[PDB]
């Protein structure tokens, strides 16, 4: 085996933060040197272990997610950080082992200004847990007085979208973000190279 990060990164279409994805990769090898040293990715932030020892250190099964996030709120991907996309879109376990990689790619999705193909949910009951999504596109209950069940006032439609102008200020370019989470089970380790 050779572990397909080319069929991860060189994909063309990415999801949105309300409908972020998963994919599990197993029985492959570790070749993170090209990811480190290609220098086409601006960000390589993570905690715990140091990248100089992940070409031998390995686990039993790894996971990956691929979707685009606002660049003015990149600190909101952390174990225990406040915010709103750190509230209703993607959570992380507190004792964190995996690693997050990001970069700026405002050339392919630098479309005509005001384009809002990618959305984000603003209002949801209470809190989040890691490792589950929200496909409930239903209109949420702000209605202490029950308005309709259909959208009205005293009640809101919480699914607002982004904006991608090729001359925006600094925080609205579409930075793609991936996370490669490490987790350990009873099974023997499988995913590493030399």
């Amino acid at each position, epitope marked *: 085996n050779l572990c397909p990060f080319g069929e991860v990164f060189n994909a063309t279409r990415f999801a949105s933060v309300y409908a972020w994805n998963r994919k599990r990769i197993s029985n492959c090898v570790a070749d993170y040197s090209v990811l480190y040293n290609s220098a086409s990715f*601006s960000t390589f932030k993570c905690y715990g272990v140091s990248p100089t020892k992940l070409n031998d250190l390995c686990f039993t099964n790894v996971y990956a997610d691929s979707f685009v996030i606002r660049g003015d709120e990149v600190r909101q991907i952390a174990p225990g950080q406040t915010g709103k996309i750190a509230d209703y879109n993607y959570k992380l376990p507190d004792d964190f082992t995996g690693c997050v990689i990001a970069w700026n790619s405002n050339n392919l999705d630098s479309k005509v200004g005001g384009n809002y193909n990618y959305l984000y949910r603003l209002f949801r009951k209470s809190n989040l847990k890691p490792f589950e999504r929200d496909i409930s596109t239903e209109i949420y209950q702000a209605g202490s007085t029950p308005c309709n069940g259909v959208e009205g006032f005293n009640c809101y439609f919480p699914l607002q979208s982004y904006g991608f102008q090729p001359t925006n200020g600094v925080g609205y370019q579409p930075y793609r973000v991936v996370v490669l989470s490490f987790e350990l089970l009873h099974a023997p380790a499988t995913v590493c190279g030399p």
Partner: nanobody
Amino acid sequence: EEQLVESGGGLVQPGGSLRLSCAASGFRFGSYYMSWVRQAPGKAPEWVSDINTRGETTRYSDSVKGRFTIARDNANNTVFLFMNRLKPEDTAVYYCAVAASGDTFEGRSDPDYWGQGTLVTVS
């Protein structure tokens, strides 16, 4: 809250010199990293320099190493910069940055709060 608006740039001649400044407010100056970054047409933002949290020790990019420097100002809530012997290829929009690491690991940590944007053209 943490506003970053920068000023002090614009048109300039070859061999010129410009003094930029971004005035931030609402938070302290001493303990936070605040770098300078460039963005050319064609995107791909490229770091140039980064002041320490301490006085004046600073690492520069190899295109500007030995040419361009930074200046620290804790009390004035702004960061200064200096150019000498400009090149026509140094045309990019300039921003300041915000803190890094947080007692965590390295790997080109990317700050979030950057500036409004100031265009600089050498001509």
